[PDB]
Amino acid sequence: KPEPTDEEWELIKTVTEAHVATNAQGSHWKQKRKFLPEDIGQAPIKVDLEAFSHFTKIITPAITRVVDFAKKLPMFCELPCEDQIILLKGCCMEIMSLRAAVRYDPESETLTLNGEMAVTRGQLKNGGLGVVSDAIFDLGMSLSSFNLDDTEVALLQAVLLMSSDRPGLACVERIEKYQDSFLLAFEHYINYRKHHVTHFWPKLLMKVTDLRMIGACLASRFLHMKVECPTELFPPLFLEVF
């Protein structure tokens, strides 16, 4: 099967370095991690607002890491400022969810947010995510046997970031051109890696769909989070990506 060209290797290196340099705690994350205690994030009587507070505090640096990842990609910097904002609003939650999902620990059954906070399925559920919490944990469980490396995670992030179907974009064709560069490099790098999983590329393309769904559902659930909570309670950067 075809493997990366020299231009594709260059591209591989760029996004991998962008990902590694924006990924919280990087190599240290499993040592710097503290478990959110069980008494926070239990099921009420709606939202457990003490758990909500802990996630409310860490969402801003999570978004910001994503902004810093996109800025390290020369193709993203080519785009007009308006398309950049559109692309960031659309892929932020998709990329954060992915970054949490690859940090699943089956021994504890936790995801690690922000490189620091390990939370359980029930805590992330009751802290405001609802059924989207089950979707992220299921994604993380099925990603163990895929054994993704930093390059593969980096390229998934790129594929999500260069989504030309976001509403309001002007460089629809330009952005889709970029996405096909990542996808072909990604396929060729996957051909070169020889995973012991059958139909790996098809199965990976299905996980991209999974993340797009999580993304679209977080946006749904945040409007249904303006019920018990007033907008003041959400940090400003979070509101910007409705």
Binding site: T64, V67, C81, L237
Partner: peptide
């Protein structure tokens, strides 16, 4: 709108 995100993109 998007003043915060926009300043993070310009920084």
């Amino acid at each position: 709108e998007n003043a915060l995100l926009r300043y993070l993109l310009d920084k």
